[PDB]
Write a protein that binds this ligand. Structure first.
Ligand SMILES: Cc1cccc(C(=O)N2CCC(C(N)=O)CC2)c1
Length: 185
């Protein structure tokens, strides 16, 4: 792809994080902690899942960023509406304000309703995310495989400002402790 020139510097918003997440000093990395991380609760925090938002809000233009997923067993990545539900159980779908892909149990799926099987020959270590607000597009690229296309959501109805979206996953197995990292420009 040729989207690299729309690169944006994303940082994580601590206030939105599940209370078990550890966000680095530079706000560019996040991982699951092994306990509650000693923060106060607030209405922004994702309660049920190890999720966090980027600080940046997008309402126009073209944006691109990259995330390192090396050696993780499970994660979700993409964008979401600023007003998505934070508390309780919910599915990742465009109807609920999410445009995402994930890894779970050795398969990659797009967060459509119902979910769509992805066809990835080279397991990615870094993912590129492209948003074209005006066109209503969210695309995902396999940086490990020369930028090959993973998935495009088109005809998106964003219906609000967008925020970068992250889920480090569940780490019941002891094999999913590694961080998500925002990769440098
Ligand atoms: C619902 C939810 C929210 C946040 C984190 C998790 C999670 O993956 N673990 C890893 C395993 C750990 C444990 N077994 O003590 C409990 C936290 C689950």
């Amino acid at each position: 792809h040729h989207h690299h020139h729309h690169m944006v510097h994303i940082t994580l918003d601590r206030n939105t994080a599940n209370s078990w997440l550890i966000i680095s000093k530079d706000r560019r990395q996040v991982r699951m902690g092994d306990t509650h991380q000693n923060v106060s609760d607030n209405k922004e925090r994702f309660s049920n899942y190890p999720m966090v938002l980027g600080a940046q809000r997008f309402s126009s233009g073209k944006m691109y960023w990259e995330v390192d997923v090396t050696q993780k067993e499970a994660w979700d990545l993409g964008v979401c509406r600023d007003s998505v539900q934070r508390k309780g159980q919910f599915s990742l779908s465009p109807e609920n304000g999410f445009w995402t892909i994930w890894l779970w149990q050795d398969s990659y799926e797009a967060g459509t309703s119902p979910q769509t099987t992805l066809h990835i020959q080279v397991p990615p270590c870094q993912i590129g995310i492209f948003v074209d607000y005006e066109a209503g597009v969210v695309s995902f690229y396999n940086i490990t495989d020369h930028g090959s296309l993973i998935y495009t959501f088109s005809e998106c109805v964003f219906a609000g400002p967008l925020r970068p979206f992250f889920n480090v996953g569940f780490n019941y197995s002891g094999g999913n402790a590694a961080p998500l990292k925002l990769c440098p420009l």
